[PDB]
Every structure is written in structure tokens, then in C-alpha cells.
């Protein structure tokens, strides 16, 4: 019974960790898009810095 309870707990924990992986993936994608923006702002700042 202890083994069964531990096994179900560990499997549900694996599911929780999969959800954590997915959350990190969404955050990573959003941050990557912000990065792609920041490259464009940097390039345009270099452009407009010309007098």
C-alpha cells in the first residue's frame, strides 16, 4: 500500500513536471519574441543615431 501510494504520487508528480516544462516553454517563446523585437529596436536605434 505504501508502494502504491508512492507510485501514484510519483506519476502525478511527473505530470506536474510536464506541465512545468510546458509553462517554461511558453515563457521561453514569449521571451524569444521579445528578443526578436529588441534586435529590431537596436538596429533602428543604430540607424537613427546617424545624424
Amino acid at each position: 500500500n505504501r508502494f502504491t501510494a508512492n507510485v501514484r504520487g510519483l506519476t502525478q508528480a511527473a505530470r506536474n513536471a510536464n506541465d512545468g516544462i510546458s509553462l517554461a516553454q511558453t515563457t521561453e517563446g514569449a521571451a524569444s519574441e521579445v528578443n526578436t523585437h529588441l534586435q529590431r529596436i537596436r538596429e533602428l536605434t543604430v540607424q537613427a543615431s546617424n545624424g
Binding site: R42, V46, S49, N50, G51
Partner: protein, 51 residues
């Protein structure tokens, strides 16, 4: 050897040339910048990242 009238004609030609020089100064334009003019501060030309 030139009398006063021919000197006056020469001076008229010189005045025309000077007027053209002044015209070139006031009107040499580049992207809305009177570069070769009486109001032309030196430029910057940002060349590279890391201003």
C-alpha cells in the same frame, strides 16, 4: 588698356559668378540638409554598435 565700360562688363560677369557661388552654397541640399551652406554643423555618422 580696358576702358571703364569693359571693366563694368567684367564686374557684371564676376557678380553673376559670385551670385552662382552663393546659390550653390544656399541650395546644395542632401536629405533636407544644406550641407555646403552657411548653416552646416559637422555630422556624426554612427559607424558600429555600442555608441
Amino acid at each position: 588698356s580696358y576702358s571703364q565700360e569693359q571693366l563694368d562688363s567684367v564686374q557684371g560677369e564676376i557678380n553673376q559668378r559670385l551670385a552662382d557661388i552663393d546659390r550653390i552654397s544656399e541650395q546644395t541640399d542632401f536629405n533636407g540638409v544644406k550641407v555646403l551652406s552657411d548653416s552646416a554643423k559637422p555630422l556624426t555618422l554612427q559607424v558600429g554598435a555600442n555608441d
